[PDB]
Amino acid sequence: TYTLVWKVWILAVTLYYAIRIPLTLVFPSLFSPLLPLDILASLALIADIPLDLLLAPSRLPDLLAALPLDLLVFALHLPSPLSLLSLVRLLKLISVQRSATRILSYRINPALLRLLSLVGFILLAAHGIACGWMSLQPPSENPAGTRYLSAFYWTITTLTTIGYGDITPSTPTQTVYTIVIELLGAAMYGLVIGNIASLVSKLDAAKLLHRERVERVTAFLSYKRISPELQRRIIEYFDYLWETRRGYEEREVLKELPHPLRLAVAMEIHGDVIEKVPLFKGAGEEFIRDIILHLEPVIYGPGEYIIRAGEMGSDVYFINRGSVEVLSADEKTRYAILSEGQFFGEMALILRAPRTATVRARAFCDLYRLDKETFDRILSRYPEIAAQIQ
Amino acid sequence: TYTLVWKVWILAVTLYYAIRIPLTLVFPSLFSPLLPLDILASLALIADIPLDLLLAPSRLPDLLAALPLDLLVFALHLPSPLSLLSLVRLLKLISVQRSATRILSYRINPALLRLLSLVGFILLAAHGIACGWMSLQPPSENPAGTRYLSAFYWTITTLTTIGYGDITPSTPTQTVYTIVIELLGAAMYGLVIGNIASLVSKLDAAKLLHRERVERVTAFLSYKRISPELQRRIIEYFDYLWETRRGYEEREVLKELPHPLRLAVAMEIHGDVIEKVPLFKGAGEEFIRDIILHLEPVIYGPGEYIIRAGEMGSDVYFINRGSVEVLSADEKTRYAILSEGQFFGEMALILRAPRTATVRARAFCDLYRLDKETFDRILSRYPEIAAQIQ
Amino acid sequence: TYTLVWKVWILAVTLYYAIRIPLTLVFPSLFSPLLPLDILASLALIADIPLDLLLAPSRLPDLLAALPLDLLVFALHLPSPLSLLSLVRLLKLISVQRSATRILSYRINPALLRLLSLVGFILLAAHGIACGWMSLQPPSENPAGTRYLSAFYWTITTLTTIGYGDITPSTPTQTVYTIVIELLGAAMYGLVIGNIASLVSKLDAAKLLHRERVERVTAFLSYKRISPELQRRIIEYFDYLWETRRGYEEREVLKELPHPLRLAVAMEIHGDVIEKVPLFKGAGEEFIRDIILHLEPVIYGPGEYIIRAGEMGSDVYFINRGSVEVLSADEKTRYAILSEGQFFGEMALILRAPRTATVRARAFCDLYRLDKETFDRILSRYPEIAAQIQ
Amino acid sequence: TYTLVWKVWILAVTLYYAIRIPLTLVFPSLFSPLLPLDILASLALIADIPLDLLLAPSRLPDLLAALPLDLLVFALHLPSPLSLLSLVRLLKLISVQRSATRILSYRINPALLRLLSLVGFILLAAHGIACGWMSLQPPSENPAGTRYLSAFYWTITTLTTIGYGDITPSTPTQTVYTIVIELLGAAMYGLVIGNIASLVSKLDAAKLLHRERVERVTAFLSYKRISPELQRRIIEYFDYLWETRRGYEEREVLKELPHPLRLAVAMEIHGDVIEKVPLFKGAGEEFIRDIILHLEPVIYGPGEYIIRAGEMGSDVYFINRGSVEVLSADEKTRYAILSEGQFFGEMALILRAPRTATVRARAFCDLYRLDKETFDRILSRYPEIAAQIQ
């Protein structure tokens, strides 16, 4: 954090040169009561490169900007086709571009960074183009603010391709300059439209991808001639899965993690659920880490049957978010009502009994389940719990 | 539905302020026979925030729009660089933007919503820019409609980057204003082109993706030097799969559902097929739910061989949509003709006989099949049908 | 094919009305020596709808275009704000749009179709806008070609947002018309740029995706500090796989086929290879169809070792495209040289011998292999070949 | 490399014709002291086609460009509507386009190639349009440089859609030409904006896709109400995986290789690790090639537990890049510290002992592991090591 202020100071120095140098080439009446900032800024540019550490095809912009190739032009009054090498300092902006595109490349969007850098370079180049236009004008008595204001008005009318045409070229050497900045204006405005069209194309990704996958599963299920009630129930399921976890599927988000982080996330999620069961209590610590990676999420809508009383039944369910209710076989007498953190279906792993009660959802549930075959497979390799459950 | 009319009333109030305030800053001859709508609209803005429920970095637009920071300007006749804070009411449009982008974010496309909101803000800002241009004109006797019509003509000629140039700036304080709205005009027109290019890029998704996957499997099969008859048959298969179910594959559409909805969809699809078989009749209800999730779809073209008489043969087929015919071993005597809802190949699960007849397709079929190994695997865990089939 | 000429005739009729009606509203000196084509075209429009077969929210454009709502205007000389309903015929273009977007929606690209239809509607609307501009001009003696040519020059200067400004509005009722077609011109030019940017964005798909996956596997393997010789060999492998089969992977192209077409493609590919082996000769026809679906493709570069003499060895290889050579254990005495259609490694399925010769590639091979476990798995369920190989 | 200079010479010849022919149609005072380059360039065009090897719908541009359809026009002084067929030579640019789009289609980006070719054709067409505009001018005494400079200024003002309007059409036959090049100017500028918007849309792919997958796994894990410490640890893991291997996952990059190249890459990666173990030393060469394809990469953050002392433990770990430390059961006495190239956990494959020490990471590790079941599965089919480990 003591070099970020140095990068800001270097940006201020090269910004200062980009605003000053084409303005003092046109008006040589400057630079004389303004040499001290040249001295300070030149020392900053010549002291940046040791603190930037020396010969590369990506170092010579800073190296050519470092040497005082100006101040000789302005003290010795070099003529017009030879003074222009005092723009060599403006190679410094490539270094500031390549530094600001990496010091904050993830604090912000990478497309918005390029667009703001382009708007900065377009204003900072419209200043230079206005200075050039004001340079190759007929010499006449005119106040030096109102003859810059017309040149900047011209070079904004040309670059933004509006083109009023109220002030136009007269001589041929103005017309050649006008042709070349019309090409540059069309190029810069094409780059601005291209970066805006790239920035707003990827602006909605999850909210467009979810709209696509709910149009796919609807235009398909209308082909199979499905009932409209069930189709409305599927559409409200996808509305739930958008307005809670933004459309993303649970088992493909946390597959993009490595094994220790995926284990840590599963340990944080199933935290206050697995310190409740009177089957895994007194078990080992290395047994919870084997069952907790094989839990699979399912989402039950309001009124769905999770367990029907009288089925064979295999697998146990852990409630994570929603509610559920437990009903008898006739669905008349309510036994109880379960909530988050609890669990049901535990009398199917250890025992070959058939289901004893009907478990209907009440709201959307987001509940995790553990299969019978998977539990008895990763129970075989731990012997003490293989004796503890018998 | 009694608050959606309130959102429409708030939109009408802030629309009213956005059309009125820059028009009454220019003409102070208004506001005196038009104060009652100021009173009504100010009460609406000051009563919206309790019915919007209080301090956040996303609440202060509505809070700054709520207080009557105008009406003091217009009753006390504040001067020109100080009256402009009566535009503080125009911060209300951020709240209406953020409300209309969520109350109907799935009734319509999310890109078309942004484009229509941008066109609304561009017209509603061209009004304010025309009022500003008409403000900093030389004062002269001119009817107040025809001097607004020229200012709006100017600010549409500038923002849509056409730029006739028939009426242009004269003073420097007009030229600075013209430079800044040329920048804003280029920005707004870049945003319009960017949103149109984003809206028409994703306009054909299924009809372009299907065109790509029929060009991939054609430019590949022309490398392998395949016969042109079979290549024409593959191309007409992909024409069938576009013009019936829009290109989407059956086993990857309904993998994006959870287990109860996928079970309900499979139960609705194989409804009038599984209450026909004299093998699964009298079976349990929990057995149909296990076989009905393991049916796999295949599509047979016209004239394809589904079953050849004399093969070993393993698996059973359920017809869902098309037709099929049953032929003898010499393919001369037609036994029968099957249709949708029926089934063939049932004498391969229970018995180790070889195929007894040749089953040729007639049109495209869309028929579901059940493997022998899968059926005998999920038949082992139900004992009563494991005795019923013996 | 006798209704496609009818669609072309209907397109010619509505094109005729779109070029004629705004030209005869301006000049009423027409229509009198040109009524017979009105009669013929009106009969075509009133006879299209029975041959188009009757009330829908997508049928009423053709129904409103069908009734002769003109010819009454032009015979009875209805005044200026009432004659304009003779543009109701121009609703017919929606029907021609919706017909031409489906009769040839796969003969051509779907984006190029929309772009050509947009260019057609933009020229066909610039005609109407030029007729309107020529309508609200001051009446003066001027030849009727050179006063249409200036109106069309104006409405192309405005719509393509160039805006010379050599001829401009004068009256207020011209200025309102100019504001509204400046908005339409900016919209049409935004749509043209959006469709061109959508048409050239997806223009290279396989040639950009392949460039991405050869930059991914290079920027990754430079992290692992891999040798440059092997990295050059991988890059020339990807150059081979572009310049033969356009980058696409063999086992994911023909997974997008159903089982009978995938079986037919594999039967056509391994045609002159499987009628050569003295192991599968005399075997059943239903055995070739089981082995021919389990062949897996691999590609060996020039000089790679396919088989090393003295290894354990399990699997057999079928050559499809390239060449290969067979060398002895010291790689000095060349046994033979194999070509396409032949096969090696056959003395590993039936026997537990170790490899007897070293098989080096010569060019790129594109050869298919069959594993030992897969062959002995799908050999167990056919008993007669399970006795034939013993 | 002796035909690339021929392609450059052909490009120079057709460039020469594209700059010369519309300039000599306007000025017939040329061609007389400039016939020798016509002779040389015509011989080059008539000798290219045998060295290009003869009748196709993609050969006739070169064939029509080959015959001297000019030089007869310029020696016999053909009149104005008949001289224009001397532009038939300009069909040669299609051949140069189709040759330069394939000789360097992978040295550079395919979109940048199309954009540079479009800028070349737009300048090279602005020359021809300026020559046509200068052709249909009123004949007057004016120096032949300053009347070309105004025509080129006009055709750059029109094509880049700026449109000053300082010089405009006068006659009708100029106005028809101006309408048609306004359409062409709008089309060319739409193509330039479309290619720039396509070139900058795909400019950041890996750096935008990685930003998306770290926003997905964050907006999901904020729904599950995860602790902020662990969420910060996941975000710094994704910062590591960007700033080392650019976001790409190890097991899906080298799945895009065939089996010999994937074997060669794994052999180069695990080179100085597998010639260290006192378990696989003295083993076969065909055993290293079977274990080295089943190594699976995992990445441990700083401070993670790789092995906990006292667990059951199954699998062995090979360190590739980072460091690690070995601690005792109380995590007080440090046994040693391991580095890259070494390995730990070897006393779990051969023996059923429980873990003997706790292995904590120090920095990010990038270490490869081998499961117990996989090792004992691919150890069963090699008998001599199955006796060597006992």
Ligand SMILES: Nc1ncnc2c1ncn2[C@@H]1O[C@@H]2COP(=O)(O)O[C@H]2[C@H]1O
């Ligand atoms: N009286 C009860 N109170 C709370 N939960 C119950 C009760 N009876 C059954 N359950 C739960 O509901 C389940 C239904 O059958 P299971 O064997 O799956 O296991 C049962 C218990 O987990």
Ligand SMILES: Nc1ncnc2c1ncn2[C@@H]1O[C@@H]2COP(=O)(O)O[C@H]2[C@H]1O
């Ligand atoms: N006479 C028949 N009528 C209708 N269907 C038949 C007839 N004979 C055979 N099939 C069906 O065609 C199938 C061909 O052999 P399978 O053993 O698969 O089972 C046979 C029956 O399902």
Ligand SMILES: Nc1ncnc2c1ncn2[C@@H]1O[C@@H]2COP(=O)(O)O[C@H]2[C@H]1O
């Ligand atoms: N003399 C030979 N001529 C042609 N092919 C051979 C010869 N010897 C071995 N091969 C092939 O090369 C293979 C090397 O060992 P295999 O046992 O895989 O099977 C061998 C044969 O398929």
